Design a protein around this ligand. Structure first.
Ligand SMILES: [Zn+2]
Ligand SMILES: [Zn+2]
Lengths: 120, 108
């Protein structure tokens, strides 16, 4: 079980690199991007968000770790959506990029903290 | 164990640092304006067991940066193609794969 969970965390790192390349690609090509980027609830559509929504009965020890990564994942997707809307509508600012980078680093931090807990 | 934990910390820092690098590239294009590579050189003389792992991540890191540079030059000069983005994504995934394989070796 522990090795199963850890595999899914490492897949989330690769999948979110590809998500970011996809956003950069769609601005340069002037595309309509994809639901995983633009949907108001895009965090439900990627592989990681689906794993999260179906976990099931969690015990009291692991709960706080899972709640933190769920919340940080959602916030990262929300900042991504807002960045893309601002770029497309010609109202972007440096602050949109800073907020997105911070959201991104909070997500990787939340994943790492759960990793450490499981390994002990 | 202390040495092993030191190495593993440096590998997780590389993941965050290369996310920030990808954000900066995206930002500079829209505005129309590294630590890991220094660490690879500073590993000192290596034994024969670890050598192949280190050589693979060094090579994959270099090719990722080269694809990034070529993507940016093509965008700026207006002859970019979908293939430039695909080559960069593939370089990026080869790098993270090489890091993971070294991680697994150290843990055993
Ligand atoms: Zn996601
Ligand atoms: Zn680098």
């Amino acid at each position: 079980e522990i090795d199963a969970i850890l595999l899914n965390l490492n897949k989330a790192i690769d999948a979110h690199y590809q998500w970011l390349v996809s956003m950069f690609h769609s601005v340069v090509a002037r595309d309509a991007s994809k639901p995983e980027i633009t949907d108001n609830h895009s965090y439900g559509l990627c592989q990681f968000g689906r794993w999260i929504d179906h976990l099931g009965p969690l015990d009291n020890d692991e709960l706080p770790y899972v709640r933190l990564m769920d919340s940080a994942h959602q916030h990262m997707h929300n900042c991504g959506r807002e960045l893309m809307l601002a770029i497309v509508e010609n109202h972007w600012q440096d602050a949109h990029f800073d907020a997105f980078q911070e959201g991104l680093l909070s997500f990787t931090a939340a994943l790492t903290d759960y990793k450490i807990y499981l390994l002990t």
